[PDB]
Design a protein around this nucleic acid. Structure first.
Lengths: 138, 757, 600, 476
RNA sequence: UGCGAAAGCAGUUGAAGACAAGUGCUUGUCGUUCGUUAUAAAUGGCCUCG
């Protein structure tokens, strides 16, 4: 029927920079404006924009990145580098935060969830290389 | 003070003789076709067909003669042979009992005894005042003798006279009229048909003639017969095969006709009274009425179980009587008797007893024969080996749990059985099933599993319980991936929350949690929260790693939410996790491996002694009252007063409970009332000169703090489970599927004549 | 739950009537109306001195005083706030008696003296309840007369309970209506209990019962929420209204030791099923439901402390767990001085947590069944072992096992009867005294495997077994409840590879990450320095321990020079195990024209 | 017998608002300054643009009436409580009252002041009196009977007064907000001309709205604050907007799961819905081409399709609407025993469901890989077949031609975390079942070589992903 | 099959009798027994009432 699905890892109830476009999009919750910012794929830009982004806005930026990856996993990779750089640049600020798991619960579930593929995928790659090794030599 | 008394019934009685096929049914319809009589293992129930309720019950316990005699009923015959609601019961030993339904059972029935010399009575039958009896005498094949029975009024005795004797009878069947018998013998094999009261029909022929040359070329399953049917007139005989092929043979000229739709071994074949129709059923759970005139077939699919036996029951074939197996439960053979109206093929009357699921198989229960040996079935060769292995296991081995989970409804007091992928709701007050609800996804009624499909395992409900208030049901289930796949080892753990307003009988699903506590981690224990915290609207979940989570229904969310959590990521593993909660609602007693912990609910952490070590691993932790806590380890049980933190009483459990039962069965065997005291149940195998099949059970009532034994009482069978009903009384389920309970003028003449007229 | 330090309200005057400390509480009356949870005022009648109203917070201060002659004794006093014909007025009623010849009933009205009136009462006034809503003053007399007066002390109604020599009367409200119950001594230790309803007659008798076995002379009586408590001879007797039936008797052992005559006992209620008990200078917060001592406090600076009244919390309805109690404290010295003191009390949450393990109440194996089935003398052994000569290993062992019939060199399920702790404890003491140095009896191995090894000997056990490796090894594998602190320093001092291995598993097995992690922080940096080096020099659990070490060290403490070496080792391990991953899964893992030669 | 089980394949507050799907954009000559809805059926709404006021039919959603009498800019189109009368303001300061749906005839024409009259509203409680606010900074209260002198002339504003509000249940109370940043409350029962008290907003006040009898929401500058007069202080404040909020409207007791909705314009192209029951928290929003100057919603008693209308400085008007055999009929009303057995047919089942129910394992797999079919629905049917234990069976009679559609999906499904373990399952079986054909078929090899590259890519992101997980643990 | 967690840790899968086929010998089987904790494959898939 209309029953809602959930998982046990749901810790919810327990130049060239676009920094200013990002900050405005995040403050106003403008998904369309945010989506344009996330479209850039140059790692050089990503560090610069996050470098100048205010630490207060950095914590909540991690929240959108978690939600957007969760809705579409195929963007997990490109969106990961933003989470990578946000934690690098604002790591010290994030330490001085009274709770992280509750406010970053979606990220942990998203990152926890994706890792479970690594064991099973390696099982394929061995089976999978075995047949590959067979027909190239043949 | 206390006393034990049997309350509910048991499984339906069946003619469990391997040779006879198609004559499994002993239940019978009245001559007026207004009520149906079903003998059970411990009683006989008469159900009025039109209203679909049990009008009358006859308990063997109530009658002294039946209590002493009950040996199982081999047949029932309407009326009394010696002589309008009389019925005669024939049991295997030979006792003949004339009793009366539609009235008050007479304490002195017309008990009689047939004289048999080393013969086990198998079947009886009549056509018009003439009675013949079939009996068993002893290559692993039982032989059969046909005798004539007559009641002499001078001596008031049943005299038995010999008519015939057939040897090494493999399979046997009787016509619907009850005047012809077809049997198969090894004298590979030969089938012979004989008239019973007359000499008209006497024919025999080797099975090789009927079998096809290809059938000889192919495997033994093609040559292996599973069922047979014989016509009333005798011209046609149907032979089923393990491959699922049916062969109709014309006896006059031994010509064969192949009817093949069943893809697995055909289990039940029955001819119609006229013979124009063949009724067939097997593993497919689908009923096939073959129209022989044009070789068509009508289908009634999605019968609840596999069809064991089939009969057309009526002067005009108005009703069909069917037997369903429910092979999904390997622990016990679950028979359900279904009377369908032929007019619309709708269920006129469905009768079945309580259907508990035990951890391991019991007594001599054997899976039905299939084309291949599977988890739910036995192959041709697997039958004897499985029987021998089962006997040798239950004798030699020490692990004999046979324990079943059961739940009670606080609002309704109605009994819930967690069947495989389903819940049976059974009312023991009335001793009748109220509901059967499938509580999981998977193949439960989508289709009938056959061949390799039968190896699939459906989702298994392991824990089923309610909140105190009773509006909420919490279900923990395990989904098993298929074999021969990469993801064939990642068992899925699912939780569901289910509520139902009292007037309905069907729950509607509100919440479902996938993989609680993470991935591949079982939910070892559950505990619903009490009235104090959240008004019985919360509950707790515990793993084998000691991780604890509290869920609760959030009104704003309109659903359940993980209020609170603790994951001590313990590397070590133990399936024995016991959980107790205080009535006020402050603490948690969490017993993991050998250590008990007192965790404060507000901080959800050890109280700031919280840690209590035990000699061995905890199976149960419970508090009889707020002041005293009872903890059972695998070697003993100990009463601890929290107020002083010193042990009151220590009872040594090792002599009876060492490794017989898996961890966690102590939970469902040990039960406690909230006011008077607790009860301890200990079962032990009885043996005279190596261990014997039968078991013997002691029930001991103990006061709070285990100071004194209120009452020690004895039961003559393995009590699978015991629990505390919300009344004083405790209900116990016994492997006989038996729920017992331990608890404290001219006008007058004219009116009579008018009534007669 | 806790008891705060008393703080002085006032110093009692040096009057002869107050010189008798044992009766001092009888000469000081506390008004019921002004003393409750929410009121900051206390009205107190000190016999022969005055009736005074004090403010408690922020500092104790005297707000009002009405003098009384020194020869007068205050028998009942009450003060409340309300409206009279409308001005807000405070009505004070006090009943004084002079030399038993006459009894005075007085009513005083104050504006927030508007009027002061006085009448002669027929008998001693015991209890005074004033109804501001109806402008009525109700007085209960020792002769059984309940007289209702207006604020002008004009007698409106008089009710006689028919019995004389009243000793106890208390007012209580339930469901918005006012009630009163009285106790009347009778002969042969019998007592009449009467419950009266306040609504032709404003007083209606609901219940009348005679209670047997209820003595007064040595009994302390108090009432709370339909429940009457009687303290007598160290037993608190628990009675419930409206019938005043006995429900429970709770024995308080610590009062049983009190010699009759010297120890001064006061008893008052503080919350639901919770009472205050004083014995001389010690104060007790007791939970009568769970029979536990929630809190205890001793006032070393005073000889005695007597409770007068306590503001009672309805914990079932009130989120507040803090209240106050007022009592009289008497100082030590040749010239004792009595003072009025207030104690702030934290009753708690009224849950069993407050009572867990604080009970004020202070074995042999027995068969399961008293009476054809498959089954799957300490002191004398104690004496024999002690009688041996020093350092006799063979005899000490031979006596232990022959007497107890122990067969195998480790604890087994068949040794349950020996599990009693007391016998084990002294055997350990005998071994320590009997044997010192390098040679210990095999018996130590038996106890060391025993599940119930005493916790008192767990400390320094590893230290005791350092000399002999096998005993040290045996302890780690099976010794119950070995302290983590010692397992760690032994882990952090030992060079043996096998011994380092087994310690880690036992630590990770029996202790959670948080418990271990905090214990890591205290360890020296030079120690943890050495054991990263050892790892750079079953292994998964050891690596897990290192991960527990590294987080404990923190990012500040870790040194780059070591960090490079650890990183290389980690780099080496990942490459191998990824390689092993591939190997593991591998282990889980017609032509149109054909040209051929035929053989003949 | 039992019925066949059917195969199994945001907020309540949001799903109500996404039903305003239909969007039509109209262009006006000048900026649409004010928008008003009729209190009465058919709830036609007025737009103030240029020198005209236009009336749009709710159902038709186009102009039905036009008021072009006004020579200069038009500043208001608020209706009367009965909806019969239309009052408006002009830069000349003249305020004119018109019969709704009768643009020809002027009922009452009043000269409030020489300065512009930017606000003109009928009093909701008392029908006769009409309030006018002008750049003269005096908010004259006029009555229809007396068109020559105001009944009351509230003063004390030191900047332009462009906001007036009448508090429900308080006919005597009048609320005005000036560009001083001060919101002034006046009592008409008293002498007036001096505010009862002033509320400081600290920013120019663009629109003041009385949400409830005691709660008034003032939207000015970049934030809106809700003030309770009983406490006289702001209960809540929200500043999520980027530009200065301009217009704000409130609707109550409408059929949505939410009882009451608060819409506020931003001047950033944003109009957002706030729920009063949860301290005015953001529940939904829209984005438009340019700054929003006006916003309104259909009244609670719309009695038909609900309308959302927003006003832009460009003159663009955006409307979003939530649309709202002679015995065959006997029915046995007089009849003795009524009986019914008619059973509705099962919902139309898809092709893949039919194949599995009919045990067409291979075809169901074929149905799985078809053009223009949902990725989720693809995972379900494959998930069923795995649950059916029909994995090798569905893959037995296949060749490279009919195997590629499965593998192409696997090439894409391996990226998704949901289908990774499922794509994992199928791939191994076909390799184990079609190793020989793989050797002799090149296309399957090149089809394969890309799969190895992608799964390798999936290895890497896992490898980083756990690196990100581990460092996050150090952070906390 | 035993234990255990779910990962896994150890340990098994023997002998006799009978039948069939091929040529006393060989292989395969068992609605035969004793003892040990101990691929499939007879063209053969689920009713109707809108």
């Amino acid at each position: 029927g209309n029953a809602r699905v959930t998982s046990g890892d749901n810790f919810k109830h327990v130049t060239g920079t676009v920094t200013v476009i990002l900050s405005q999009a995040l403050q106003s919750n403008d998904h369309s404006l945010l989506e344009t910012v996330l479209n850039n794929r140059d790692e050089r830009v990503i560090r610069d924009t996050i470098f100048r982004l205010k630490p207060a806005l950095a914590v909540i930026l991690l929240e959108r990145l978690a939600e957007r990856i969760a809705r579409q996993t195929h963007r997990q990779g490109p969106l990961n580098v933003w989470v990578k750089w946000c934690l690098i640049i604002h790591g010290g600020y994030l330490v001085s935060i009274p709770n992280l798991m509750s406010t970053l619960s979606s990220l942990h579930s998203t990152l926890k969830r994706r890792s479970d593929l690594l064991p099973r995928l390696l099982a394929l790659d061995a089976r999978l290389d075995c047949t590959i090794n067979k027909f190239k030599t043949l | 003070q206390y006393k034990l008394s049997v309350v509910s019934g048991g499984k339906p009685a069946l003619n469990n003789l391997s040779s006879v096929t198609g004559n499994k049914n002993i239940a019978r319809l009245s001559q007026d076709q207004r009520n149906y009589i079903i003998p059970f293992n411990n009683q006989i129930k008469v159900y009025s067909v039109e209203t679909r309720q049990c009008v009358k019950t006859l308990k063997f316990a109530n009658n002294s003669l039946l209590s002493g005699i009950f040996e199982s009923i081999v047949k029932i015959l309407l009326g009394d042979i010696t002589v309008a609601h009389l019925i005669t019961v024939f049991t295997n030993n030979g006792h003949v009992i004339v009793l009366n339904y539609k009235g008050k059972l007479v304490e002195s029935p017309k008990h009689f005894k047939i004289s048999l010399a080393d013969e086990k009575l198998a079947n009886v039958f009549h056509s018009e005042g003439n009675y013949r009896i079939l009996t068993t005498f002893k290559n692993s094949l039982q032989s059969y003798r046909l005798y004539a029975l007559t009641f002499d009024d001078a001596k008031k005795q049943f005299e038995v006279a010999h008519q015939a004797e057939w040897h090494n009878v493999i399979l046997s069947n009787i016509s619907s009229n009850g005047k012809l018998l077809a049997h198969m013998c090894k004298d590979h094999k030969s089938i012979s048909v004989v008239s019973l009261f007359d000499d008209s029909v006497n024919l025999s022929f080797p099975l090789g003639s009927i079998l096809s040359s290809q059938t000889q070329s192919l495997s033994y399953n093609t040559r292996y017969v599973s069922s047979m049917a014989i016509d009333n007139m005798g011209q046609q005989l149907a032979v089923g095969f393990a491959s699922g092929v049916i062969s109709i043979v014309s006896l006059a000229d031994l010509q064969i006709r192949l009817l093949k739709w069943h893809i697995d071994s055909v289990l039940s074949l029955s001819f119609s009274h006229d013979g124009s129709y063949l009724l067939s059923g097997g593993w497919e759970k689908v009923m096939s009425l073959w129209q022989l005139e044009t070789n068509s077939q009508q289908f009634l699919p999605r019968l609840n179980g596999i069809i064991i036996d089939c009969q057309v029951l009526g002067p005009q074939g108005n009703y069909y009587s069917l037997i369903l197996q429910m092979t999904e439960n390997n622990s016990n053979s679950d028979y359900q008797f279904l009377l369908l109206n032929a007019s619309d093929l709708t269920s006129k009357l469905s009768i079945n007893g309580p259907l508990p699921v035990f951890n391991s198989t019991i007594k001599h229960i054997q899976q039905p024969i299939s084309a291949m040996n599977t988890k739910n079935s036995n192959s041709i060769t697997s039958l004897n080996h499985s029987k021998k292995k089962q006997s040798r296991k239950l004798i030699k081995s020490r692990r004999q749990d046979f324990t079943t989970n059961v739940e009670i409804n606080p609002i309704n007091k109605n009994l819930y059985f967690p069947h495989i992928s389903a819940v049976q709701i059974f009312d023991f007050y009335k001793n009748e099933q109220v509901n059967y609800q499938y509580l999981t996804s998977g193949v439960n009624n989508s289709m009938g599993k056959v061949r390799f499909e039968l190896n699939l395992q459906d989702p298994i409900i392991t824990d089923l319980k309610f909140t105190k208030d009773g509006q909420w049901m919490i279900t923990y289930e395990i989904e098993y991936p298929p074999n021969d796949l990469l993801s064939s080892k990642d068992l899925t753990h699912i939780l569901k929350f289910w509520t139902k307003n009292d007037n309905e009988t069907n729950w509607n699903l509100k919440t479902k949690v996938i993989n609680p506590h993470g991935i591949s981690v079982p939910i070892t224990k559950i505990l619903p929260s009490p009235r104090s915290v959240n008004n019985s609207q919360g509950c707790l979940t515990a793993d084998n790693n000691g991780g604890l989570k509290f869920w609760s229904f959030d009104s704003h969310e309109s659903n359940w939410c993980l209020k609170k959590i603790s994951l001590p990521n313990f590397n070590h593993f133990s399936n024995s996790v016991s959980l107790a909660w205080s009535q006020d609602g402050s603490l948690i007693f969490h017993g993991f491996d050998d250590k008990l912990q007192i965790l404060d609910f507000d901080t959800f952490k050890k109280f700031e002694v919280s840690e209590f070590t035990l000699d061995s691993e905890i199976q149960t932790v419970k508090l009889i009252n707020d002041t005293n806590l009872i903890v059972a380890t695998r070697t003993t049980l100990n009463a601890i007063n929290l107020l002083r933190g010193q042990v009151i009483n220590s009872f040594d459990l090792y002599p009876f409970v060492n490794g017989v039962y898996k961890n966690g069965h102590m939970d469902r065997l040990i039960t406690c009332d909230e006011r008077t005291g607790n009860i301890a149940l200990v079962i032990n195998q009885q043996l005279t000169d190596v261990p014997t099949i039968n078991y013997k059970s002691r029930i001991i009532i103990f006061d709070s703090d285990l100071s004194t034994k209120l009452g020690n009482f004895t039961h003559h069978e393995y009590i699978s489970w015991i629990g505390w009903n919300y009344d004083t009384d405790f209900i116990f389920l016994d492997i006989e599927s038996t729920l017992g309970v331990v608890g404290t003028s001219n006008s007058d003449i004219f009116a009579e004549q008018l009534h007669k007229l | 739950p806790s008891l705060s330090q008393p703080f002085r309200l006032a110093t009692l005057p040096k009057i002869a009537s107050l010189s008798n400390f044992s009766l001092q509480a009888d000469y000081v009356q506390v008004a019921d109306g002004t003393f409750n949870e929410s009121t900051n005022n206390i009205t107190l009648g000190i016999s022969g001195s005055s009736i005074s109203q004090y403010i408690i917070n922020p500092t104790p201060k005297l707000t009002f005083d009405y003098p009384i002659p020194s020869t007068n004794i205050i028998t009942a006093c009450n003060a409340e706030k309300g409206q009279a014909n409308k001005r807000n007025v405070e009505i004070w009623a006090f009943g004084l008696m002079v030399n038993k010849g006459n009894y005075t009933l007085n009513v005083i009205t104050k504006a927030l003296f508007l009027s002061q009136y006085k009448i002669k009462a027929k008998a001693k006034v015991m209890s005074i309840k004033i109804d501001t809503k109806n402008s009525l003053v109700i007085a209960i007399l020792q002769n059984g007369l309940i007289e209702i007066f207006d604020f002008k002390l004009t007698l409106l109604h008089s009710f006689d309970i028919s019995y004389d020599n009243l000793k106890y009367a208390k007012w209580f409200t339930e469901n918005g209506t006012e009630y009163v119950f009285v106790l009347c001594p009778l002969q042969d230790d019998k007592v009449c209990y009467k419950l009266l309803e306040l609504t032709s007659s404003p007083i209606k008798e609901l219940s009348s019962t005679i209670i047997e076995g209820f003595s007064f002379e040595n009994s302390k009586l108090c009432y709370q929420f339909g429940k009457l408590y009687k303290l007598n001879q160290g037993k608190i007797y628990i009675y419930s209204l409206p019938h005043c039936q006995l429900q429970q008797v709770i024995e308080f052992p610590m009062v049983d030791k009190l010699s009759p005559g010297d120890d001064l006992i006061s008893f008052q209620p503080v919350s639901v099923n919770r009472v205050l008990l004083t014995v001389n200078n010690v104060i007790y917060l007791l939970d009568l439901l769970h029979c536990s001592t929630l809190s205890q406090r001793e006032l070393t600076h005073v000889k005695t402390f007597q409770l007068l009244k306590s503001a009672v919390i309805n914990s079932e309805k009130s989120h507040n767990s803090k209240t106050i109690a007022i009592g009289i404290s008497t100082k030590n010295g040749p010239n004792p001085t009595s003072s009025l003191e207030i104690i702030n009390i934290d009753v708690g949450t009224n849950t069993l947590k407050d009572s867990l393990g604080k009970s004020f109440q202070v074995v042999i194996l027995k068969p399961l069944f008293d009476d054809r089935v498959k089954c799957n003398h300490c002191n004398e052994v104690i004496e024999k072992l002690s009688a041996l000569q020093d350092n006799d290993i063979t005899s000490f062992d031979d006596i232990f096992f022959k007497e107890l019939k122990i067969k195998e060199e480790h604890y087994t399920e068949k040794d349950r009867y020996i599990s009693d702790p007391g016998f084990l404890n002294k055997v350990l003491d005998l071994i320590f005294g009997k044997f010192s140095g390098n040679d210990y009896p095999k018996t130590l191995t038996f106890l060391l495997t025993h599940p119930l090894f005493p916790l008192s000997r767990t400390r320094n056990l590893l230290s005791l077994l350092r000399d002999q490796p096998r005993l040290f090894k045996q302890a780690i594998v099976t010794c119950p409840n070995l302290p983590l602190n010692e397992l760690l320093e032994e882990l952090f001092s030992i060079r043996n590879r096998e011994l380092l291995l087994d310690i880690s598993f036992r630590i990770l097995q029996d202790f959670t990450r948080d418990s271990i992690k905090q214990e890591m922080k205290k360890l020296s940096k030079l120690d943890v320095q050495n054991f990263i080096e050892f790892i750079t020099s079953q292994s998964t659990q050891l690596f897990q321990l290192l991960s527990l070490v590294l987080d404990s060290i923190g990012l500040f403490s870790l040194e780059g020079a070591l960090l490079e070496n650890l990183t290389l080792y980690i780099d080496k391990q990942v490459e191998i195990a990824e390689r092993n991953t591939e190997l593991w899964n591998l282990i889980d893992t017609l032509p149109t024209y054909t040209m051929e030669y035929l053989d003949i | 017998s039992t019925a066949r089980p059917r195969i199994i394949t945001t907020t309540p507050e949001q799903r109500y608002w996404r039903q305003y799907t239909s969007a039509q954009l109209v262009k006006e000559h000048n900026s649409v300054t004010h928008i008003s809805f009729n209190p009465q059926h058919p709830h036609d709404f007025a737009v103030t643009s240029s020198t005209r006021v236009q009336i749009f039919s709710s159902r038709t959603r186009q102009v039905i009436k036009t008021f072009s009498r006004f020579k200069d800019v038009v500043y208001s189109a608020s209706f009367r409580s009965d909806g019969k009368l239309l009052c408006a303001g002009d830069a000349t300061g003249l305020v004119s009252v018109y019969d709704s749906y009768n643009p020809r005839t002027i009922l009452l024409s009043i000269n409030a002041s020489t300065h512009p009259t930017h606000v003109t509203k009928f009093h909701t409680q008392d029908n006769k009196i009409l309030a006018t606010a002008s750049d003269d900074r005096v908010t004259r209260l006029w009555d229809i009977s007396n068109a020559y002198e105001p009944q009351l002339e509230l003063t004390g504003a030191t900047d332009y007064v462009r906001t007036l509000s009448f508090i429900p249940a308080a006919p005597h109370l009048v609320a005005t907000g000036s560009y001083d940043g001060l919101i002034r409350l006046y009592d008409t029962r008293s002498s007036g001309s001096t505010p009862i008290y002033s509320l400081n907003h600290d920013q120019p006040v663009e629109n003041v709205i009385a949400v409830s009898p005691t709660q008034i929401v003032s939207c000015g500058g970049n934030n809106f604050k809700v003030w309770d007069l009983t406490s006289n202080k702001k209960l809540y404040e929200r500043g999520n907007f980027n530009k200065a909020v301009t217009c704000l409207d409130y609707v109550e007791n409408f059929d949505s799961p939410m009882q009451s909705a608060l819409i506020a314009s931003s001047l950033d192209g944003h109009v957002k819905v706030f729920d009063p029951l949860d301290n005015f928290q953001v529940k939904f929003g829209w984005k438009f081409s340019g700054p929003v100057l006006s916003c309104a919603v259909s009244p609670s008693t719309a009695q038909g399709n609900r309308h959302l209308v927003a006003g832009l400085s460009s003159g663009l008007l955006a409307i979003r609407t939530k649309k709202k055999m002679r015995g065959s009929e006997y029915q046995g009303d007089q009849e003795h025993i009524i009986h019914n057995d008619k059973v509705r047919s099962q919902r139309r089942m898809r092709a893949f469901e039919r194949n599995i129910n009919q045990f067409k394992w291979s075809e169901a797999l074929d149905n799985a890989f078809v053009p223009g079919m949902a990725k989720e629905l693809t995972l379900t049917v494959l998930q069923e077949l795995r649950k059916r234990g029909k994995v090798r069976v569905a893959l037995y009679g296949r060749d490279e031609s009919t195997l590629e559609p499965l593998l192409n999906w696997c090439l894409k499904g391996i990226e998704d975390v949901r289908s990774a373990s499922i794509v994992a399952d199928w791939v191994a079986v076909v390799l184990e079942l079609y190793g020989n054909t793989l050797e002799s078929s090149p296309v399957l090899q090149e089809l394969m070589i890309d799969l190895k590259t992608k799964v390798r890519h999936e290895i890497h992101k896992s490898k980083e992903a756990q690196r990100i997980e581990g460092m996050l643990q150090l952070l906390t």
